[PDB]
Amino acid sequence: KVFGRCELAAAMKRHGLDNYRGYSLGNWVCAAKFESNFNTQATNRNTDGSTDYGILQINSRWWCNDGRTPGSRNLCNIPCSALLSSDITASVNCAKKIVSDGNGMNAWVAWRNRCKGTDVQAWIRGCR
Ligand SMILES: [K+]
Numbered sequence: 507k508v509f510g511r512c513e514l515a516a517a518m519k520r521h522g523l524d525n526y527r528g529y530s531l532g533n534w535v536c537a538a539k540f541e542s543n544f545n546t547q548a549t550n551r552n553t554d555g556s557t558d559y560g561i562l563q564i565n566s567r568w569w570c571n572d573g574r575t576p577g578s579r580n581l582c583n584i585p586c587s588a589l590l591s592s593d594i595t596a597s598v599n600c601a602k603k604i605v606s607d608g609n610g611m612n613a614w615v616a617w618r619n620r621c622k623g624t625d626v627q628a629w630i631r632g633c634r
Contacts, residue, residue, distance in 0.1 A: 512633035532626030540616035560589035
């Protein structure tokens, strides 16, 4: 599913991301835009052989099991395919564990390079 901007903001807020660990809702929407273009089905292979899954491009090296990343961990204890469903619940709950691991939203390269330090509130401007 390809979310709309305001559709995604509302679902992220319902699932507890607004100001989660201090990051306002606009940061998560901006991150999703540049990680996945709001597409729940986005997948992207990493040079080390791991894969990024879903709306927040969560990495199988540490967080989910795809059965094809040797020597990886599954810290969210889910199949990476759960991160691709139209329901973002699994992506959000795993994102919460990622952002709580010590580096905040710097875990998402797109956030550090394209959202950090910008007017991220614009991403939720106009939404109900
Ligand atoms: K932080």
